[PDB]
Amino acid sequence: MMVWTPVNNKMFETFSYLPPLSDEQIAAQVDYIVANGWIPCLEFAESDKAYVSNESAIRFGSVSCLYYDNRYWTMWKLPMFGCRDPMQVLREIVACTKAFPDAYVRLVAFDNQKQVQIMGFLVQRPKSARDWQPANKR
Amino acid sequence: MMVWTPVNNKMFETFSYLPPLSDEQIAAQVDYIVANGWIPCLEFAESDKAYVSNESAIRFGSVSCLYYDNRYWTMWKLPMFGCRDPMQVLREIVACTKAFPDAYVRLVAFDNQKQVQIMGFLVQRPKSARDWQPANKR
Amino acid sequence: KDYRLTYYTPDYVVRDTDILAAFRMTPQPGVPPEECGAAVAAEDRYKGRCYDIEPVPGEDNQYIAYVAYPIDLFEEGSVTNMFTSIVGNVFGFKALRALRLEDLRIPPAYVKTFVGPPHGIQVERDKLNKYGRGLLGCTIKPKLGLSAKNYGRAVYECLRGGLDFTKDDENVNSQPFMRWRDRFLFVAEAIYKAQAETGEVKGHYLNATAGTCEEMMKRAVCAKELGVPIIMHDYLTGGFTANTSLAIYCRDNGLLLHIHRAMHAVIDRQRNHGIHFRVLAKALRMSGGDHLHSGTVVGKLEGEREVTLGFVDLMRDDYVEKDRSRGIYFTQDWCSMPGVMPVASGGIHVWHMPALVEIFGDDACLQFGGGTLGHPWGNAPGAAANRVALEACTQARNEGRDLAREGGDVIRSACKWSPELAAACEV
Amino acid sequence: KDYRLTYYTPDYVVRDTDILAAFRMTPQPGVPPEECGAAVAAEDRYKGRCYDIEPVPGEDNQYIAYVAYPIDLFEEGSVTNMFTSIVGNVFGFKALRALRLEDLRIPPAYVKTFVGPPHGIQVERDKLNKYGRGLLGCTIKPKLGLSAKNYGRAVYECLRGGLDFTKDDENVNSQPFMRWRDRFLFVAEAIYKAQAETGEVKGHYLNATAGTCEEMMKRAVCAKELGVPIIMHDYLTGGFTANTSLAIYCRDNGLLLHIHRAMHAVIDRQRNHGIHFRVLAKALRMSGGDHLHSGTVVGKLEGEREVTLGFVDLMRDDYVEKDRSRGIYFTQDWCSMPGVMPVASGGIHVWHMPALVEIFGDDACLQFGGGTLGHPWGNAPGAAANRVALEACTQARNEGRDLAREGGDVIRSACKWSPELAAACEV
Amino acid sequence: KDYRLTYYTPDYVVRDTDILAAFRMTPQPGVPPEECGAAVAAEDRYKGRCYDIEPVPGEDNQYIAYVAYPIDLFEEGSVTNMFTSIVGNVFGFKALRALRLEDLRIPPAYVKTFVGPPHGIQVERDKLNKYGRGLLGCTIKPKLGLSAKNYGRAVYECLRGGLDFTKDDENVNSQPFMRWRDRFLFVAEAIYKAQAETGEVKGHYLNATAGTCEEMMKRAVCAKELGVPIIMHDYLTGGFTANTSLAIYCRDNGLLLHIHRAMHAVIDRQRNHGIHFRVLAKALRMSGGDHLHSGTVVGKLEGEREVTLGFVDLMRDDYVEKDRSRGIYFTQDWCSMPGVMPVASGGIHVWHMPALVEIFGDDACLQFGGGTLGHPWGNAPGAAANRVALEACTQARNEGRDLAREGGDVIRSACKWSPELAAACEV
Amino acid sequence: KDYRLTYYTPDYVVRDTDILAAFRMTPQPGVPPEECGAAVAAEDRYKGRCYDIEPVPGEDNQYIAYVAYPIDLFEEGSVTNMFTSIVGNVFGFKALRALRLEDLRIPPAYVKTFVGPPHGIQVER
């Protein structure tokens, strides 16, 4: 009988309760993003802009319901319009973390006909962050 | 004439103005928990989730009366249902602090017929914390 | 009560502003189908007229009466007026033995008069920042008898392990053992604590169903001022006037509105008589609600599976074609009214998860009231075991695997690296 | 004023909705007990009827008249109407010389019409996160004359050393030397500072007793908006209408309600005449209050000790059997109305603490108005000396030791390792 | 709890802003009178000090302790604070056996801080346009069980025959048989009808005593909006905070405030212990009320007659000298605070009317609860029979006749020309 | 969903504060009446317990299940809470084929918590 740990166990909403995705598993998801007409795009945040916070609600009246901070991350470049090749997306993951070695990276997707964000899942964690447990978190 | 100290003198509500309980005194309290039909259970918190705080009230209107944070601690395993032996509880105190060496531990008890928490008292302090005075606090 | 000449007009062409109704209609022995069908319409510019009568194949004494209603019979923005006009008097009529309203058509000139759901599927999903998978839920297991403190402790450990929502029992309102306002604080202490630990947005459907409209708005003001995301409402026992009032308050203050369906099987269970759930689910959408219990699909034959996929499309989609195989008797343009997320009560264990991802896809909440509580390690490993199994089955879908066949081999590939799921794989 | 035929019905069987009353009744010399007892009942569907008359052993001219009242005589939710019907006119009656109402029976059909105490023992204890021991208190020693700044400085040092609550004097309301609103800030500055230092939840009973219902709600809005936990109310001098108003406001906004009992000994002291405190304590529970001064038990004989244990069970328990030895004359089902925590004025020193833990157990507040202030080192060592002695006596109970005998040897075992208690052991 | 040096100051000269109190004080056997008297004062700028102790003639163990209080101990405008400071703790004190507060002195610097009675004797009399005689009243005879319709029919026939006021029973508030708001309309239909018939102003004391301050103000808004003249309030069971709230509302909207005194004999009956009614009648005036039940004087000896004439002068007059024979222990300047009209419960018959006109004069209401109802012809001839007897006795006073002697010959001179009084003369 | 031991208590004596319910109850073919009747009660201080089951004369497969409810399950003054507790979930239950709630008993400790009709027959008249 084990205990799920409360200490340094931050998660990102999709595919975070799974072990970290390999480059073949990230390419398998982009194949799903390209098989229908979705548009992949990368995002990133530092350790202090990654997960959710309340800090702008010091300026509020009672309008705080379903307001959070750090739901936006900074877009990396532009959405890959007309993206057919999943390796072009996978080159940008290496290129983003080279520019930002202390940054989380998530791959989001957008629908073209519905004009909304479809799927969003973490594809990279920094090594310098102690916010997450390496899949043995009991 | 002495002065009670204000500096690094945090306390936990029950049995904190006493010197730290020995394993025979913790076993004497679990005998009191088992002599009637109560159910012992352990909890734990880190140094930042141990004592009381106000930090979620940044999201509030004027609904702050008798709201605090850090009144919940994380449960360790499950409540010991059908617990007759006080050494089975005392093994779990060593087992909890091995998993979490930087964590406070309290033994809570629950009533079965009233379905409420009965008694709750600190049974372990971490050594890495400088929040408490070692019983000579003047 | 018709003379069959004025209320049975088969040569009539329906309007694009007409409200259409489809009644499954069992006559008394000896009453003609046309005279019985015009009597449902009768209950000249304001008459409802039966325009088509079809036999039901396999049933020797059942018929489908299609009745059209002029749009002037109805109040703008009122589900109370819409139900009172259509099903307010006809079921007590003596010349028919049983009557079921099967479907409605709401025309787009009358869809636009309603406020509707406060946020919908697309806006809720943006606000909770959860994408690409189904949402997960859990009812707190003992419905009554907890203290308020021990309620949030059950709420804390469930949201901690990975779930997105926890849920009040629908008969948890305000009782002597746990008053409602003591509950809303220990819930909000448990939501803000499980949120700060996981870094994800968490919620609990706080039951704002109450005895009067003033109690009900007093609970909802309380959830506004704690800043908690979502409340719930029993709408067939609170009624449509209380629901539409709350749903407008939820739009005006950014709260989400989960909608539970207590008392639905008094109305929708029997096949020869009542109001089928797809009418009651269209009417919830027009009244408003962000989530709605749509029921279980696991443990059922694939004739109720196609019907359940029919009223889920009426909840989620914008334009639903006519499809008699799924029970959809009209064409429904929803005219950019937002979708309602269906809440599906998952099975006892995690092995129904490949069934639910294939049936529902992403836009569904999934609830495991005894899946998280019945884990041998507790609530937080049990909540992880569902969350691991949900994301494993979602990944196998995107990789292309058939979850109707390979869904057992995907759960077993995740029993390996995760100990929490393996302890639930072992049961 | 009875004719003794209609109002003295000994053959009558009482109802489960009846309000029952038990009057200790001294007649004039020459008046029969039955005629005097039916006159208390007289004051057909609305008559109160005396159904039993018992002699009092040892008193040659006292009797116990049991009077039943129909439930239709009373307003739902009103202690003002309940006292006005039962004791509103009978005590001025001339054929009796003295009259004491001893007990009431409130039937569960009329207990349920009241809102009751805002939180109760179980919810308050959850909210303050204090378990397994009695709560501790201290009145600030100089009742009047402080500045508001020097009041909170006395409030700061007491809550700092280990106490859970400090207390306004009941005649501290708003006076020229310390207005009420200047007091509520220096109290809240002293509570939030003693809280952040100890890490424990702290409170001060801020006296919201006021001159009008509008002043009284204005104090209480002030405690809501500072977010301080608990206010207090004098209810026999403010009245039951003001108390029930405040108690509903305290439920509606999560404040706790300490209840002080100023003017109680005008009413309850004399044995032949008045209203005994157990009626006034049942009526406080129905009106509402979270704490109630129940009095001292130390320094008293064990005939007042058994009576004091009787009305504390009426405050705390759900179902209290009939027990003539403890003064309980009826059976009281409280029908899940929450308990009231009794506040017991502890003695001058710490040696009464083994007496109070054995008499009261955990569900009691204990107050030392001159126990913390009279320490030779000050308020914060004096507050520790009680808190050390309280937790030492609590531990000796759980270990199994008899505090009626070994209670001196437990205090002396804690004078050793604690210097603060030893300085109070020395006095 | 005094050391007898600081709290017993016989050389002290009292101030003109001091609150003075006079306690009838029975010590335990062996306690000195000076030490017991300083302990009542003890309970330096804020101390109450016993300044005079007198023996009571005829009582071997009773004393009169005079205690002075500084004006800074008190809240402006608060009878709740004034009672909590003076009688809040002293009666439970153990060194005395019994304690009665007999009189207070309210100094004119503290009389002026109160709002007081809304209208008073002089303004009420102007508004009702009734001069030169006592006002007349009647309680509706069956306290409970009427319908609301049959209540006003009893109210209609009584005000019709000549009375000035009818009265709710004090336990008529809002019950299942007659809710309060159904009562206020049939009363107002009966007042406006008996008014239009007689041409005189009529009223009924509508009981606004309620369960909460919000119910109580809701009844009073109802009497404002019907435009009816007068409401009533039970102030020792509703409390002084509810009373002072209502009395300020009655000033702010021109309603009159009758004040009933339910529960007074719990407090004021016993001679050795309690609070005498003259303190409770001074405190009602400071809180406010336009009428106050002062009790019966008929059927009593002339030692309670002189006491009853003493507290009626405290209610009505502006300046009341010290008079130990009437129980007045201090001098009371009322500093132009308006008078309170005493309501005197008249006897069963009309022959007590020459007694009541001579004792009370004009500024009194007189009530005949069984005088109007018990007439053999009904309510309207019975109400005339009192009104004829009242005006006959008033005329014999102005003509100079002694109503203590010739009062029977004045009633019998009016039995002749009036048949209604003669039917009551015959009983 | 009962195990038939805890929710079918025929030896139980009902309380004067109990809410009583009378269900006309048609089982599936093969389900016992006692197990079907305890399942309507199941939906220890808060359990509803089926205390009596009677056959219906003339109907070969209908029964009257009498279920008692503790008064603590309910909100004071709320018909929404009273219907949600009693008929909120039981009619979708699969082991019975049809279910009719026939009568309720509202106990006088719970009648008194409601405001009720504004005037009534006697006051309106």
Curated annotation (Swiss-Prot), chains A, B:
Q: What do the Gene Ontology cellular component annotations say?
A: chloroplast stroma
UniProt-annotated location(s): Plastid, Chloroplast; Plastid, Chloroplast stroma
For the keyword Chloroplast, the answer is yes
On whether Transit peptide is a keyword of this UniProt record, the answer is yes
Q: Which UniProt keywords apply?
A: Calvin cycle, Carbon dioxide fixation, Chloroplast, Methylation, Photorespiration, Photosynthesis, Plastid, Transit peptide
Any one GO MF annotation of this record? ribulose-bisphosphate carboxylase activity
Q: What is its main location?
A: plastid
Q: Which residues in this protein are found as N-methylmethionine?
A: 1
Q: What is the additional note?
A: The basic functional RuBisCO is composed of a large chain homodimer in a 'head-to-tail' conformation. In form I RuBisCO this homodimer is arranged in a barrel-like tetramer with the small subunits forming a tetrameric 'cap' on each end of the 'barrel'.
Q: Which family does the similarity line name?
A: Belongs to the RuBisCO small chain family.
Q: How does it assemble?
A: Heterohexadecamer of 8 large and 8 small subunits.
What is this protein identified as? Ribulose bisphosphate carboxylase small subunit, chloroplastic 2
Q: Which organism is it from?
A: Chlamydomonas reinhardtii (Chlamydomonas smithii)
